[PDB]
Structures are given as C-alpha cells and as structure tokens.
Amino acid sequence: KLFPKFSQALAQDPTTRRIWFGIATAHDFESHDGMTEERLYQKIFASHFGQLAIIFLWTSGNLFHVAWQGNFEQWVQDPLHIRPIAHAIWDPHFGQPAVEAFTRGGASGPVNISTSGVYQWWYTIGLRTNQELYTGSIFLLVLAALFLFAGWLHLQPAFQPALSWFKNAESRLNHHLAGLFGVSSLAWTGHLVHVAIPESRGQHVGWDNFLTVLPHPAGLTPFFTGNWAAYAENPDSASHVFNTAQGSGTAILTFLGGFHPQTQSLWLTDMAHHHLAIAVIFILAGHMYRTIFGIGHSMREILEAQTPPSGSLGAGHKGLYDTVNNSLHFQLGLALASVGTISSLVAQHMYSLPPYAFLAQDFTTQAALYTHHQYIAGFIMCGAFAHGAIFFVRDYDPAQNRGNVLARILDHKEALISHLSWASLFLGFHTLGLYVHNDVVQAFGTPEKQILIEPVFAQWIQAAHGKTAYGFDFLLSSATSAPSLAGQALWLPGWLQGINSDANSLFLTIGPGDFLVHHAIALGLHTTTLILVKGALDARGSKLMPDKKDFGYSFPCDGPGRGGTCDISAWDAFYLAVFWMLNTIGWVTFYWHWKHLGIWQGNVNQFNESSTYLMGWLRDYLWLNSSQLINGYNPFGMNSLSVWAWMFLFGHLIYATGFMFLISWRGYWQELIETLAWAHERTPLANLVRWRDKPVALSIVQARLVGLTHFSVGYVLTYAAFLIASTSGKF
Amino acid sequence: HGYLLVGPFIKLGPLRDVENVAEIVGCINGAATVLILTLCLAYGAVTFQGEG
Amino acid sequence: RPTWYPGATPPKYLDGTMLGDYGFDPLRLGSKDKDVLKYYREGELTNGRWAMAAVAGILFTDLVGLGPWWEAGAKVESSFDLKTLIIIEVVTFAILEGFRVKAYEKTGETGLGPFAPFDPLNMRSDETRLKELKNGRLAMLAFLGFSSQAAVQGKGPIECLQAHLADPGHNNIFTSSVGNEALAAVLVLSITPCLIEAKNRLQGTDEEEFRPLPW
Amino acid sequence: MSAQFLPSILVPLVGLVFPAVAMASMFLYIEKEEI
Amino acid sequence: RTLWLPGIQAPKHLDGKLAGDYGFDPLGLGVDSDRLKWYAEAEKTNGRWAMAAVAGILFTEILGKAKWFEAGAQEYWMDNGPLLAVEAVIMGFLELKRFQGWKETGTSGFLNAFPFDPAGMNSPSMATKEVKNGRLAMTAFVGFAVQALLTRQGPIEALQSHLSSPFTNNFVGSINNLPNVIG
Amino acid sequence: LADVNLVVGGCTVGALALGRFVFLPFHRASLAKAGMPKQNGMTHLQAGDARAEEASFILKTNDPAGFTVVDVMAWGALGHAAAFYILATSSLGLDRNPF
Amino acid sequence: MPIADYQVFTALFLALATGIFAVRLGVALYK
Ligand code: CLA
Numbered sequence A: 001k002l003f004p005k006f007s008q009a010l011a012q013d014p015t016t017r018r019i020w021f022g023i024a025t026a027h028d029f030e031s032h033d034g035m036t037e038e039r040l041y042q043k044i045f046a047s048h049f050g051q052l053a054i055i056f057l058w059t060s061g062n063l064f065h066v067a068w069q070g071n072f073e074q075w076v077q078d079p080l081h082i083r084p085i086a087h088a089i090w091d092p093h094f095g096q097p098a099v100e101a102f103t104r105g106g107a108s109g110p111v112n113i114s115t116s117g118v119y120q121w122w123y124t125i126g127l128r129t130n131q132e133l134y135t136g137s138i139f140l141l142v143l144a145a146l147f148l149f150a151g152w153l154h155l156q157p158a159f160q161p162a163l164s165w166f167k168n169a170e171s172r173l174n175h176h177l178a179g180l181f182g183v184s185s186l187a188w189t190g191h192l193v194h195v196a197i198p199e200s201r202g203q204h205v206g207w208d209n210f211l212t213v214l215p216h217p218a219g220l221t222p223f224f225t226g227n228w229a230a231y232a233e234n235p236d237s238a239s240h241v242f243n244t245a246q247g248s249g250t251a252i253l254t255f256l257g258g259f260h261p262q263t264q265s266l267w268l269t270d271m272a273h274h275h276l277a278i279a280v281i282f283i284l285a286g287h288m289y290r291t292i293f294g295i296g297h298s299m300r301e302i303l304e305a306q307t308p309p310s311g312s313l314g315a316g317h318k319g320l321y322d323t324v325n326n327s328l329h330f331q332l333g334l335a336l337a338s339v340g341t342i343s344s345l346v347a348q349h350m351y352s353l354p355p356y357a358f359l360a361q362d363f364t365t366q367a368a369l370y371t372h373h374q375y376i377a378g379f380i381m382c383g384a385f386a387h388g389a390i391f392f393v394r395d396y397d398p399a400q401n402r403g404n405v406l407a408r409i410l411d412h413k414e415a416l417i418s419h420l421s422w423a424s425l426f427l428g429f430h431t432l433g434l435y436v437h438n439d440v441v442q443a444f445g446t447p448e449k450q451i452l453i454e455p456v457f458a459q460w461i462q463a464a465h466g467k468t469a470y471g472f473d474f475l476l477s478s479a480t481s482a483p484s485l486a487g488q489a490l491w492l493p494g495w496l497q498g499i500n501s502d503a504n505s506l507f508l509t510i511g512p513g514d515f516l517v518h519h520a521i522a523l524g525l526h527t528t529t530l531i532l533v534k535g536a537l538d539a540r541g542s543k544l545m546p547d548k549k550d551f552g553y554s555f556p557c558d559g560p561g562r563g564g565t566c567d568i569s570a571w572d573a574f575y576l577a578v579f580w581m582l583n584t585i586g587w588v589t590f591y592w593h594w595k596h597l598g599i600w601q602g603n604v605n606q607f608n609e610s611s612t613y614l615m616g617w618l619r620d621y622l623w624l625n626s627s628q629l630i631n632g633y634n635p636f637g638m639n640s641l642s643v644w645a646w647m648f649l650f651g652h653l654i655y656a657t658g659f660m661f662l663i664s665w666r667g668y669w670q671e672l673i674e675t676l677a678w679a680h681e682r683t684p685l686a687n688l689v690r691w692r693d694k695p696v697a698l699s700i701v702q703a704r705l706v707g708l709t710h711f712s713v714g715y716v717l718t719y720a721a722f723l724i725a726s727t728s729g730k731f
Numbered sequence B: 001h002g003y004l005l006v007g008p009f010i011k012l013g014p015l016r017d018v019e020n021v022a023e024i025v026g027c028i029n030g031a032a033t034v035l036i037l038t039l040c041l042a043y044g045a046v047t048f049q050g051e052g
Numbered sequence C: 001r002p003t004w005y006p007g008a009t010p011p012k013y014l015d016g017t018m019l020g021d022y023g024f025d026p027l028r029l030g031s032k033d034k035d036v037l038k039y040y041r042e043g044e045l046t047n048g049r050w051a052m053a054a055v056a057g058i059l060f061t062d063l064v065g066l067g068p069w070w071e072a073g074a075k076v077e078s079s080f081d082l083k084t085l086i087i088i089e090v091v092t093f094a095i096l097e098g099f100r101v102k103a104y105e106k107t108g109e110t111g112l113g114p115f116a117p118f119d120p121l122n123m124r125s126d127e128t129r130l131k132e133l134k135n136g137r138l139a140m141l142a143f144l145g146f147s148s149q150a151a152v153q154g155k156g157p158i159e160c161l162q163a164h165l166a167d168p169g170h171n172n173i174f175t176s177s178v179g180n181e182a183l184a185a186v187l188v189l190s191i192t193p194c195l196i197e198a199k200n201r202l203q204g205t206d207e208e209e210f211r212p213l214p215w
Numbered sequence D: 001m002s003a004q005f006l007p008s009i010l011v012p013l014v015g016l017v018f019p020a021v022a023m024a025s026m027f028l029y030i031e032k033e034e035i
Numbered sequence E: 001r002t003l004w005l006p007g008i009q010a011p012k013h014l015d016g017k018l019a020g021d022y023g024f025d026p027l028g029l030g031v032d033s034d035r036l037k038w039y040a041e042a043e044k045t046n047g048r049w050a051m052a053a054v055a056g057i058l059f060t061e062i063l064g065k066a067k068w069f070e071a072g073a074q075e076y077w078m079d080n081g082p083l084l085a086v087e088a089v090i091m092g093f094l095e096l097k098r099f100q101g102w103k104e105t106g107t108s109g110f111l112n113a114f115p116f117d118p119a120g121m122n123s124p125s126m127a128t129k130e131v132k133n134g135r136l137a138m139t140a141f142v143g144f145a146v147q148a149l150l151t152r153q154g155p156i157e158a159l160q161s162h163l164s165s166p167f168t169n170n171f172v173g174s175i176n177n178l179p180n181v182i183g
Numbered sequence F: 001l002a003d004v005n006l007v008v009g010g011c012t013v014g015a016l017a018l019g020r021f022v023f024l025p026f027h028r029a030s031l032a033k034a035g036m037p038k039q040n041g042m043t044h045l046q047a048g049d050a051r052a053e054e055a056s057f058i059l060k061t062n063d064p065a066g067f068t069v070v071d072v073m074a075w076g077a078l079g080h081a082a083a084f085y086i087l088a089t090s091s092l093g094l095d096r097n098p099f
Numbered sequence G: 001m002p003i004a005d006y007q008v009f010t011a012l013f014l015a016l017a018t019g020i021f022a023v024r025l026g027v028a029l030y031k
C-alpha cells in the first residue's frame, strides 16, 4: 500500500480509492511530495520529449501499415476509383461472411478502408511507391528513438537545464519564430520545389537523383540576380493532368489562386510560394527580441509601456510579463486557446480550400477530417479555459497584479457573467422560438407562414469576395472596383472562377436555414463560454463560498449547509461546460454534414427547405441517413457496414452507461457496497479470499469524471460511426 | 474444478459442431486453469508479503 | 576481470564468485533469488552438455560424408517402430531425469544415475568446471549457428565453411537472405556498449529501482 | 502482405500475453507495501 | 594575446588555457566547464578526421582515381553490407576504447594508450599546431563539399580551373553555370 | 531591369549610413530605456542562466559612435531586404495598380 | 514493389531498440 510514490497521503488510504486517485493525479507534478520549481520544469521537459517520440512513432506506424498492407501504389494510378486501405484485419472472432465482406480494395484478405486522408496527402507531397513510405517510417522511427534519448539525457545532472533557462522567454520566442517556424517553412518550400512540384509533373526526383535535377530551367541565377519573376514564367496549364507531363510547366513560385481543374485542390506552386513568404516573415519576426547581442526588445518594458493614459485600463499591463513567465498554467491556457482556434481554422479551411489532390472527391475523408478537427478544437478550448481557472486558483497573486488588466477584469466579473448570460438567453429564446414557430406552421400545412430571415450580412460579405449570386456588386463583385483591378492579373481570375462555381465548397450559398443554424452555433459558443468564464472568474471565491481558493481547484462540495453547495468548484464549471461544448460541436458537425450531403448528391433543395424546422433535421437527416448504418447486420446477413452498426450501438451503450454515474450519486452505492462486503465476509469457501483494499464507492468528483468520460466517448463513437457509415454507404 | 470446466466449452464452444471439439475444449480448459493459476499466485504474492 | 565488452561494469550482484562470470545479464534474470540463479546455472550446464554432444554428432556425421543432419531424421532405417522408439526413449529419459533430479537435490550438481558426482577418473575441480561451462556456451552458439546456416543456406557445418573460404567477401551472413536484418543488428550492437558507458557517465552506477525482466 | 504469419502472432501477443503480463505486474506493484 | 576581433576582450570563460584560444565565442557555447572540455575534445576529434579526410581526398585525386564524392559508387572486393558491418564493429570497439580512456584521463589517445604520444614531440606549441591545422582542415573539407555540390569537380581541378580565369571561374560564376553542369 | 550590384550596394550603404548617422540616437535611447530582459526583477543571467550573458565582442568597439558589428549586420539585413524587394517588384511586368 | 519480409523484420528490430530507449526514458522519469 504505497504505490502513489508521489503522494504520501494517498499511499495511506486503505481503500480502493488510493489506486483510483493514484492514476488521476500522476501528471499533477505541482501537487507531488517534495516538488520544486526546477524539478517540475525538468520533468515537464522530459515529458515533452516522450510525447514527441510517441507522435513520431504513431506517424511511423501509419506509414508502415499503409506501405505493408495498403494499396497506395494502386491508388496512385486510380485515385478516384480505388478506396484507400488503412491496415489489415486479423480477428479470430470473424466468421466467413465477415472475412469475405471486409475484403475490398483488391486486398488479399479483410482490411480497413482509410478515412484519415493520408493517401491524398502523401500523394500530393511527392510520395509514389511503398519503398518511400517504408523509408519514411524507418526515418521517423530513428527520430523517435533520438528524441527518447534526448529526453533521458536532459534528465541527468550534467545536462539538466536551470530554471532560469526555462524563463528565457525572449530567446525561446526568437528561436521558435525564426527557427521552429521560419526555417521549417523554408525547408518545406525546398522539398516542394525539389520533389512535390517535379513529381506532380511526371518527373521522379528522389535522394538518388535530386542533385542532378534542376528545380527550374534557370537554376539559382534569377534568385540571386533579383529576377524572381522568372520563377513564375509558365505555370501548369488549365488542362494539366496530375502525376503526368501533359499540360505541365516550369514555374515553381506562382500565385494563380483557385483550384486545380483536375485534382480540385490548390496548386502546388501556390503552396510553395506561400511557405516561402511565410518563412521569410517568420524569420524576420524571429529577429525581434533581445538576447545577448545588445539589440532586440524587452517584453517586460513593452508590457509596462502599454498603459493608456487617463487610466482607462488602470495600470495597464504592468507585471504581466512575470505573471505569464512564472505561471505555467497561464502559458498552457494561452497555448491551448491558440491551438484550439487554429484547429478550428484548419477544419474550416481544408473543406473550402482542399490542399491535397483528389481530396474534395473523397466525401468520407473530408467529413471525417472536418469533424475530427472540430471535436479536437472543442476539447482543447475547454482545456484552455479549465487551465485559466486553475491559474486563477493557484498562481494568481493580487499584490503582483494590483491595478493591471487582470485585477480590473476580476473587479467587474459580475458585469461579464451577466452580459454573457443575457446574450445566451437572447440567442436561445429567439433561436428556439423561431425553430418552434417554423415547426408549428409546417405541421399545420402552412409553410408560407415560416419566419425565414435572409442572412443579408453574410451574403454581403460573400459578395465582397466575388460571389455574384446575390446581386450586390460590391468590391470583388464589381470588375471596375479598385481591389478588382489591382489583382486583376494576379490571383483574382482563379479565385473568382472557384468562388462563383457551385461544384466546390468555396463559399457555399446560404439562406434562412444557414441563418438559424448559425445563430444556434452562436448560442452554443456563448453558453459554453459563459460556463467556462463564470467558473474561471469565480474560482477564487463567490458570495456562497468566499474562501473557495483555500479549497483548491477541485473538491466535491462544501456540504449541504447554506442551502446546498453541489458543483461549486471551478472543476465543476469545466465539467458542466464539456456537455455544452459537445452539444455545440454536434450542432456544427450536423450542419456541415447535412449541407455537404445535399451538395454531394446534387440536391441543395433538401437542406434549403428542411433545415428551417427541427422535424426536417430529425427526419430528413438523422432518420433518412441511418437506414444503411442500422442495416450493417440483420437476420438476413451482414456487409462491410456491420462494424459501424456495432460501433453505433456501442456508443449508445457507453453514453447510457455514463448517464448512471451522472444521475446516481455516492450514497446509495456506499451502502450497497457495505452490504456486498458483509455478504463476502459471511460466505463460506469465499472467506478464504480477502481483499487487500477496502472496497468503497467512487468519489463525488471521480464519479463526475467517469460519467463525463462515458458521455463523451459514447457521443464521439456514435457520431463517428453514423458519419462514416452514412457518407461511406452512399459514396 | 478442471474436470467440471471442460463441459461448457465442449457443448457451447465455437467448434462444438465439429468432431474435434473434445480436444479443442481440453486445451481451452487447460488455458483457463493456467489463468486461474496465475490468479492464485498473484493473490498469494499480494496477500502474504508481511507478518503481524 | 574480463567482461562481455572492454571496460564493462558488471552488476552489483555479479561480484565474480560464480564461474564464467563475465558480468553479463542486462535483463537481471538472476539478480533476485540466489537459488533461482543456481537453478539457472544448472540449466545452462545441461543445455551446454546437450549442445556439445549434438555438435559433436553433427560434425562427425558431416565429416564421414553422411547426409544433412536436419534431414537425417527420415533417413534412419532399422527395427523398432517409431512409437516403440518414442516410448523407450520417454521411459529411459524419465528414469534418467529422475536420478538427475535427486542428484541435484542432494549434491547441488548433475550426475548420471545413482552416482551423485559420477567421476570415475576423478577429474573434478573448479578449473575443470570453468572449461565445461565455456565449452558448453561455445557449443550452444555452434548449434545455433548450425541451425541458422541450415535455414538460411542449404549447406551443413562443413559445406558452409568451405563456401566461406572460397569467397569470404561474397559468402557471408551479410550477403545472404538475412543480411539486411544482420546489418541492423551489428549497427545497433556496435553502439550498445558505448551507449551503456554514457549511462555509467552521466547517470552513474547507483543501481536501479526496477529490473528489466523481474520474474 | 509480406510475412502473413506476423499478424497471427503479434495480435495475440499484444492482446492476450502483453495485457495479462502488464495487469499482473501492475497488480503486484500497486500492493507492495514497500516499493 | 591576439584576439579574433581588434578592440574586444575575451568572453571571460576563455583565458588561454586551451590551445588555439583566440577568444572566439560570440554565441557563448563554452559557458559550461564540463561542456567546454567535451567541446575541446570534440574539436580535436573533428579536426583530426577532417585532416585525414582532406589528405586522402587530395592524395587520391593527385593519383587520378575517382572523384572523392563518387568513390562510394565504385566496385570493391566486398559489398557495402559486409563492409559497413565490419567497419561498424571495428569503429565501435575503437571509439569505445577511446571514450573509456577519456573518462579516466580527460585527454586524447588510442586503444589503451592515453595519451597516445609515441616518440614524444608533445608540447604546447604542438597542441596549437594541431588545433589550427585541424580547423583549417575542417574549413577546407566544407569548401570541398560545397564546391563539389556547385561544380562536379575535384579540389585540384577546381583550383586549376580558377587559376585559368579567376574573374569568370569562381563561386559567383559557378551559380550561372549551374544549368550547364546539373542535368 | 535594375542592376543587382548597384541596387544591393546602394541599399546596404544607405541602411548602414542611416543606422550610423541618423537612427543611432533614437536606437541608443530606446536600448537604454528597454535594457536587457529581466525575469522576476532581475536579468536572465542574474537569475542563473549562464547562456544569457551578453557577448563580450559587442560590449565595446573601436568605433567612436559605439556602432557594433551586430549593428552592422542588422542594418545590412534591412538594406538587403529592401534591395531585394525593389529588385523583385521591378522584375515583375504585371499591372498591380488599382486603376 | 511491395516491401519484403526482411524489411518488416528490420523495422520490428528497430522498433524494439526504440522501445528499449523509451523504457529507459520512462525509468529515468520515474526517479
Ligand atoms: C531553432 C532552435 C529551436 C528549435 C528548432 C526548437 C524546437 C522545439 N522546441 Mg525549443 N528552445 C530553443 C530553441 C529551439 N527549439 C531555445 C533557444 C530554448 C531556450 C530559450 C528552447 C526551449 C524549449 C523548451 C522549454 C521546450 C522547447 C520545445 C520544442 C519543441 C516544440 C514542440 C514541438 O515539437 O512541436 C512542433 C511545433 C511546430 C512544428 C511549429 C508549429 C506550427 C503550427 C502550430 C502547426 C501548423 C503548421 C502546418 C499547417 C502543419 C501541417 C502539417 C500537416 C500536413 C501534418 C520543438 C521541436 C518543447 C518540447 O517539446 O520539448 C521537447 C519545450 O518544452 N524548447
């Protein structure tokens, strides 16, 4: 009974809880016995190395499985008539019909059809054979081993970095902006110019011959002479065929804009040019902060100088540099917020602007990627706000931030929470009212009485980008406008050709249904933010619990006194916000999937007419697209969709199981377990066997965590199964 | 325990409708016995490790 | 004391009392209980003796020009059906192993039948035991090489040696069907001692909380 | 796929041998009294 | 003591105890004593390898043979597999012995002789002569590699080509001649 | 169109002259007002970061105005950036005017 | 040109070495 090596108090627990809490608090290094700041930072650094090695191993495994049991080589020849293979299937429980049903893409046996889009990405970056994939997997394997050795090395006393080294924010930002971001982008540009671009033109360029192949006919001379325009002489023709030399070109840094007519994706030359410009800008930005060369900036002085007069912002940003550098939770919250927003941006840009060849034609992959990134973004956003609350309850110092932006924003937290609640109430009241009004008028057979508000603002913005479907004739919609003439011979031709076409997702047509669903999304975001912000601002204390900060970030409650204090900690606020985040992401993914489902089948009228009322959402989307999924296996037989049907029921079961931990609380189970213990201690033969840990019911916080985990797992599994089965059984 | 544990797999195993079901089940019971064997060893090593 | 690589630091429990102690045990299989270590040594000696007998027989049959040793199982013609031979061998080996078990339980070493030490020539000593241990280890690797050469190559212990002598630069393991894998092993093993030295330099030799293979 | 026999050996090793060994070791370690 | 830059001072951690100490450390990498010792040994090792490499490249190019950057693509008595394996084993043993000798005595050496100084001739003047020659060799090897990358010619051939017409056969002229060479 | 030698040389010389005779006072004043980065009230070197020690090859230079070599590299970098921007823009023969 | 069996074996061996490095890092982190 001493497993929690990091917690002596937990080791003394004689119940099973000791094991439970021994695993849920293993990564909270700040709360471990005999923990200092230097050891904390060093442990985090080594953990980062381990995580990097894990990521490298995961990528290497994906590459190895695609090169060993996939059909990448066959898919290259026919990227539109062959389903990518993820990996093989070796399940002893499979029956003969199951083994025969899972054999698809010309495989020797049962396999899994890929849905992550790695085939399109690897095909777009220049990979063509299985040997290249195997080489990449081996290289990533060696890289992972190298990172593991680095993590072990930096844990030794001779290579242990000091705490001050971790606080050197200027040096770290300089190296990350100029090297981690700029140099990496420049190297990617080099790869695209040397491999991706030549490979897309039917010319193979590998390690064995990249030194004898010219990326451009006029090698390096125009670059050093300044005649950079010579690198965009003749781009790929509009009738170019990917992976071949018909209608090719010699340019390597173009800016046509739009999509490739055959692959329906962005031009490789455009992406190379983008990465080159990004690398230059990032390197320049990296040469900003002061290190040891007498030049640069001091973030502390910049923050102390950002104090507007008249005292509108109080002391301004005085002491913020130390508030961010000293607190790890503040940095983690900022990083999580930024990463989540970038994940959402990635999801929103990969479907409207496909970057990989033959990716827009893969309806299953596009939907899966969008949903995956949106769910990841939601979880990361919840984590960002949770860590912000942790910062307020564990690293915030009122004396060090007296009068700055933090103290002032905390001084009027009531106004913030009140306005968030008002916005949420308004959005909910009106969105639900309009939807119910439309449902009632639809039921009574009077669709003409529907309240269909035209999204004139979004349509106006779309017209500003070149869409002429709304008759606005604004900026890019007018050929004689200044912005239209400025880029007339640059990127506007392709951009307009792609935005005015209904065959792609570049700014889709919107109507009243989009208006209502967008307001529903605004509702979800506002309520989730309200819960998270209320929990972070009230983490230190409220009127019901003035000394909440003395009890930590997470605790069961404060007893039934003072009327009751159930779910009063900041952890509980994050817990309640996870449900809202799941609901918001569900609404977003439902909207995206239904709109694209109607677009792929050439029937936008279905969504344009059935999305204005909830019955259309439940009947024309959920019930209509669930026929093939629930038919994966039936008393007549089974097909390749049986795995998705089983996963569908599996998710439903996990979700319902979580409902138990969510509704039932600790009290009933404690008495039940006591009765069970009495039964075991009085049953003959079984008396010879004793328990090492006293069985007890799950903790209140532990129960909430288990219920939330079950709810989230069931939610994700159910939607993933439905999404893949619905978009895969049709296309 | 080992004798009473063959029957279930004999009459209900995945290969119950095959003449070689008896052998497969004998092996299955052997595996189950070995599993409950390691269970007994783990219980003994955890329960009996100190004196009082 | 010579180790399994120059300058190697043997484990704390591998002081050197046992014979053939080269400080080799990366998995720490016999670093917990001493009785288990004694049983492990007895098993090593038994495997070594069987390996020496097998290697001697395989080499003798090859030198007299007999067929492949791996194929000799089906080229034996004589009386006694296969089942009869199996039964006779099982019974005689059961009694022999029982006697060996009693010998180990009594004197702590091997024996032949009722004779606990079995040494008619009285050639027992600590110096003669080391010879048996080292010869057994060499014979074990020799038999492993015999099987590996029979699997990769289609030759025997003598034919493989002749093929290597004919063209040493082109008739080696790195040029066979398992050369690539072999190239990956050497390259790793070649850096294994040095890497261990790094652990003995940056981390030191202050033992470890766990063992690779506890058991 | 090359070496079709590998999955038939790796799948049971990762799903039956490795989990049983890991669970037994974890159970023996979380109840050691003196680690 | 002469410094790499007129008008400055040594970066404190460098005061002349090491051979070839010119106070050159703009980035301050040697701020750690143990790391400074390891870096000095690494500099000596890299310089020795570069010296041997440059000597071999020049010697082979004088006696004709193949280009230094194309010697690996030739045919030898043994394949690359066994060759790399034998070299890996030999170099692993040699480097292991060298590292072990450095742990006991923080100095260079060979096999089991640390330091490896047969016939004497070891003195402070020799220490700086080896460090400077090694640095020059590393710089020369980098020049060889980059020059070969731009112009597929050896070191001596490149020098002769430059001597034929230095104003139009240098590094600037090699960039314009890249399309004519590569392809 | 534009001579790379003349444009690059002129831009670099102009940037160096501006940073040595025009922008030097404001640059020095800003450097003195900002100073070296500090963590928890003390510089990174004072906190224990040995790698944060200012380089000695910039502490004092023989130039009467204190124009260090790092200053030369920074201004030369700006000059080259401007020169190549001019060369690249002049190399293109398209109409970017919004008229 | 599908990957051969020897390639899979080499990859598995390299993965074993990587796993050894990983377990070493984990042991160092536990300390
Ligand atoms: C040029 C020098 C340099 C470089 C290259 C790095 C690089 C790195 N450092 Mg480091 N560091 C440096 C200097 C440098 N550092 C210095 C001088 C200091 C002291 C001041 C530090 C102190 C330091 C600490 C304390 C830590 C790091 C960490 C890291 C790693 C960050 C995590 C990661 O891998 O994600 C990679 C990040 C990127 C690739 C950039 C992100 C770009 C966006 C967000 C992604 C989107 C791009 C694109 C769209 C993706 C498409 C790809 C898709 C097709 C798959 C990373 C490899 C962390 C670590 O993990 O430790 C191992 C960490 O803890 N550094």
Ligand code: CLA
Residues within 6 Å of the ligand: A023, A024, A025, A026, A027, A028, A029, A332, A379, A380, A381, A382, A383, A384, A386, A390, A553, A554, A571, A574, A709, A713
């Ligand atoms: C870079 C990302 C990152 C990092 C480094 C951290 C780091 C940390 N977090 Mg944090 N967090 C993050 C993101 C991150 N978080 C995100 C995205 C969220 C939103 C979900 C949260 C929400 C969160 C909360 C609410 C809390 C922390 C806490 C903590 C601290 C302790 C964590 C711990 O105890 O480990 C323990 C690790 C676990 C218990 C693992 C959880 C088990 C998972 C959820 C179950 C998964 C089951 C699996 C999916 C089932 C598969 C299905 C299949 C079987 C069918 C720690 C410093 C805690 C803290 O700060 O203490 C005060 C705290 O209470 N985090």
Ligand code: CLA
Residues within 6 Å of the ligand: A421, A422, A424, A425, A426, A427, A428, A429, A432, A523, A527, A530, A531, A576, A577, A579, A580
């Ligand atoms: C379908 C289920 C559901 C519904 C409808 C709501 C609704 C609401 N939630 Mg909630 N939530 C839910 C599930 C739900 N939640 C779950 C499962 C969780 C996890 C436990 C949470 C956790 C949660 C938190 C933590 C918070 C909310 C908040 C809110 C309110 C946000 C304000 C708003 O949107 O204005 C719109 C209002 C509505 C849509 C309610 C409908 C109005 C009715 C229909 C009008 C009455 C007409 C008629 C007279 C009915 C009376 C008939 C009767 C007399 C017979 C809102 C009332 C936030 C809040 O309180 O905001 C300030 C808040 O902080 N929720």
Ligand code: CLA
Residues within 6 Å of the ligand: A653, A655, A656, A657, A658, A659, A660, A661, A663, A664, A668, A672
């Ligand atoms: C679908 C969700 C769900 C599920 C599965 C359960 C399941 C259960 N509930 Mg429960 N309950 C739920 C929802 C759920 N509840 C909700 C939402 C509430 C709130 C009102 C409650 C409130 C509640 C109360 C108050 C009580 C229970 C009790 C029980 C247990 C009854 C014993 C039993 O059924 O025998 C067997 C268990 C099952 C049939 C569950 C499925 C298990 C499957 C069939 C076995 C699968 C084996 C597994 C896959 C193999 C291992 C694989 C390996 C990877 C681990 C049982 C485990 C009662 C109890 O404690 O037990 C007496 C009890 O008093 N529940």
Ligand code: CLA
Residues within 6 Å of the ligand: A054, A057, A058, A059, A060, A061, A062, A064, A087, A088, A089, A090, A141, D006, D007, D008, D010, D011, D012, D013, D014, D015, G008, G011, G012, G013, G015
């Ligand atoms: C994280 C990446 C990853 C993932 C998720 C998988 C997943 C899978 N692999 Mg695979 N593998 C990987 C990497 C990965 N592999 C790498 C890099 C290699 C190159 C050596 C292989 C080589 C390989 C072979 C030869 C085979 C599989 C097979 C399989 C399947 C059955 C698992 C099995 O028993 O094989 C065992 C897997 C291994 C022995 C090597 C995997 C080692 C990885 C890198 C461990 C990663 C651990 C992770 C980072 C830490 C997470 C913590 C977790 C352990 C709790 C399964 C779907 C089998 C199959 O094809 O099924 C039909 C099969 O025979 N894999």
Ligand SMILES: CC1=C(/C=C/C(C)=C/C=C/C(C)=C/C=C/C=C(C)/C=C/C=C(C)/C=C/C2=C(C)CCCC2(C)C)C(C)(C)CCC1
Residues within 6 Å of the ligand: A280, F012, F016, F072, F073, F074, F075, F076, F077, F078, F080, F081, F084
């Ligand atoms: C001492 C002296 C003097 C002075 C002299 C001089 C003046 C010198 C110089 C020099 C120089 C002259 C310098 C400069 C520098 C720097 C530089 C030169 C840099 C750079 C670079 C860069 C950073 C670039 C980048 C890029 C790339 C790479 C690509 C494209 C894009 C870009 C452009 C961005 C006098 C006579 C007065 C007096 C006495 C003595």
Ligand SMILES: CC1=C(/C=C/C(C)=C/C=CC(/C)=C/C=C/C=C(C)/C=C/C=C(C)/C=C/C2=C(C)CCCC2(C)C)C(C)(C)CCC1
Residues within 6 Å of the ligand: A329, A330, A331, A333, A334, A337, A341, A384, A385, A387, A388, A389, A391, A392, A536
């Ligand atoms: C609580 C807490 C925390 C956390 C927080 C968070 C989580 C935040 C966030 C947030 C977010 C999540 C945000 C976002 C954002 C965004 C923005 C702010 C934006 C914008 C805009 C603009 C400026 C734009 C413009 C433009 C352009 C550029 C072009 C096109 C057009 C347009 C208009 C679009 C911390 C720790 C820190 C502190 C303490 C506590």
Ligand SMILES: CC1=C(C/C=C(\C)CCC[C@H](C)CCC[C@H](C)CCCC(C)C)C(=O)c2ccccc2C1=O
Residues within 6 Å of the ligand: A660, A661, A662, A664, A665, A666, A667, A669, A670, A696, A697, A698, A699, A700, A703
């Ligand atoms: C069912 C239930 C129990 C009883 C549940 C118990 C006692 C846990 C039973 C779990 C058993 C031991 C099996 C574990 C199942 C998981 C598969 C274990 C996986 C965990 C590993 C990854 C460590 C509570 O104690 C409780 C307490 C407070 C609120 C709600 C509830 C509640 O709903």
